Amino acid sequence: SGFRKMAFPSGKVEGCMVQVTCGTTTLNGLWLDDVVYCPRHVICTSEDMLNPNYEDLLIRKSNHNFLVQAGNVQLRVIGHSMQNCVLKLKVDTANPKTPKYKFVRIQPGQTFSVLACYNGSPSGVYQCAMRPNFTIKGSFLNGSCGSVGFNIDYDCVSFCYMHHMELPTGVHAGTDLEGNFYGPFVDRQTAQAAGTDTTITVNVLAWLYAAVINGDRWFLNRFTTTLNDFNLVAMKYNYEPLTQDHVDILGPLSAQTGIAVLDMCASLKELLQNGMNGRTILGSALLEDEFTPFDVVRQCSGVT
Amino acid sequence: SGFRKMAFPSGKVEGCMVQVTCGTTTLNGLWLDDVVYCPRHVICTSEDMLNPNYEDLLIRKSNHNFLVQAGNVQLRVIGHSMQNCVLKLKVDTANPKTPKYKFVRIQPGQTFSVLACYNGSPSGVYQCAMRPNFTIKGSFLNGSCGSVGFNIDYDCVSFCYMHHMELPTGVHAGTDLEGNFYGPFVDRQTAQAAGTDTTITVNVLAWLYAAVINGDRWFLNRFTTTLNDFNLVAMKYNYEPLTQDHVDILGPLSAQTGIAVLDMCASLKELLQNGMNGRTILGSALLEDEFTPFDVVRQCSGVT
Numbered sequence A, B: 001s002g003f004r005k006m007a008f009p010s011g012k013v014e015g016c017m018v019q020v021t022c023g024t025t026t027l028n029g030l031w032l033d034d035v036v037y038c039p040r041h042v043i044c045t046s047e048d049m050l051n052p053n054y055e056d057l058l059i060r061k062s063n064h065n066f067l068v069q070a071g072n073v074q075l076r077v078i079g080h081s082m083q084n085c086v087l088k089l090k091v092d093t094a095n096p097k098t099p100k101y102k103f104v105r106i107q108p109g110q111t112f113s114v115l116a117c118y119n120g121s122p123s124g125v126y127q128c129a130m131r132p133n134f135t136i137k138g139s140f141l142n143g144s145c146g147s148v149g150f151n152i153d154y155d156c157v158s159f160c161y162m163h164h165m166e167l168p169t170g171v172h173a174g175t176d177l178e179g180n181f182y183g184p185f186v187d188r189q190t191a192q193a194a195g196t197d198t199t200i201t202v203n204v205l206a207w208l209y210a211a212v213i214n215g216d217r218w219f220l221n222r223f224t225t226t227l228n229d230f231n232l233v234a235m236k237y238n239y240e241p242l243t244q245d246h247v248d249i250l251g252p253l254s255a256q257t258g259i260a261v262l263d264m265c266a267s268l269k270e271l272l273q274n275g276m277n278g279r280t281i282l283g284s285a286l287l288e289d290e291f292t293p294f295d296v297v298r299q300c301s302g303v304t
């Protein structure tokens, strides 16, 4: 029993982190096979960051300008290319600690672990969600760029995020490992405002199911609702609309608890309308939306 | 910017986790040098757990009865002993992945990372505190026992916790790596009730400092207080008494923010007396007490 905000074990990713230095800029790279992936803004002076032309800036860079260090050993760079907003540095040595891996582009509401790194060195691991506005609420200081987000399925790391920037509002933007930003963000020091940070309804429901499983039941009520009725309340409270797809995804938690999804919707409806009245659920005073149905099942069933 | 509940990278500990099987009971062991450490209740049938005599039960166990598996390779057990509530199994092979390590017995209020494991296999990593009642609020299913809590100082893992049991209230009890329980708990299936779960005042203050540093300032007020006046309010709200030692420990955060510790105490006082009025601090609707002053400094300064 007990339910915690839980990250994947980070060892497989720790083995992939390197330092990338171009001139005076240092950040993190991800070493997989004989390629180091890093944000392309490694080639910029903060002077460059106001309106960088990356193709023009990259013309001035040779393989020997990219200093790649894995622990205290230098890697030999034998090629470099720009894909979207990442650099791919070809090195002469395959990473011997390369795990089975995939690159995946996640959807808003999907959770992942971040291994925060500075100078290629892991500092910590936490769990995030891709927000519906394609920001993430991270913990990232200067030097953290190139830190990655990932999921693990048994022995296969799916890399979904690389950190590129903080918005003036202190939220985070980054790319998949093909270098494509999540959302409308660009790697420039310009006015970039996030949209509405809506609550991931299907995740809140999953976490309400987790609460029931772990003994927190005070919020269960005598009511039910319909997808359309629930969605009217969701819209009013800046909750994402709930679809039959979300209902289907909640089926196994429905089944395990014997609480119909639409009954738990009616519980959530009363919580939105009435607040917590100073009570807590799984040690939270607000409705947690950074657990997926898959996450709740995993943690509640103990998958490794 | 951003402030997250952050665990240590788990790789160094992942390399130490093994499966220990005695008869039909499987749990986790910690392999350091040529010793595997595990809960002594590995030798029990759940029948035994009602009033086990561990010395008598252990007489019936030989080295060959302890099945130790690291990945899919069996370790040869060449000795076994009971220290307090842990077994130390001597194996014929030093763990090649043994990190620099220490065993430390932590104080209530101290935070650590847990690597939750099942069958010697890591499932996840989260951050905990030793509660003032010497429980921890974990996420532990059957098979998770022998999972460890740790801190990392650069390259040295300090092991502070091994998981032994859930109380009927769904909170967790365990030992240091010398096998001594935190608090008054015993490894028996008996009536064991936790004391008052008081709030770790010095940690809440640290986290208020973290909030200011990361831009959440609405709760800063025009007031100050004294240790004695604050402590009257702390007692009323089941907060731990604040000492000059706690004030001294908060000095660097005081200095960085230019907010006197006693001013932040007066902020905390008004939050206790007035509640959050539906507002949040670092994405929480309650006062977080599982960040130490050291944790706040670390995450805010980016130590690896």
Ligand SMILES: *CC(=O)N1CCN(Cc2cccc(Cl)c2)CC1
Pocket: A027, A041, A049, A140, A141, A142, A143, A144, A145, A146, A163, A164, A165, A166, A186, A187, A188, A189
């Ligand atoms: C994450 C990190 O290490 N850094 C923050 C970004 N900074 C350069 C930069 C400025 C503006 C926009 C972008 Cl995409 C990058 C480097 C340090």
Ligand SMILES: *CC(=O)N1CCN(Cc2cccc(Cl)c2)CC1
Pocket: B027, B041, B049, B140, B141, B142, B143, B144, B145, B146, B163, B164, B165, B166, B186, B187, B188, B189
């Ligand atoms: C943690 C774990 O894997 N398990 C929970 C404890 N259980 C045996 C037990 C019962 C009662 C008290 C104690 Cl200390 C242990 C084994 C499974």
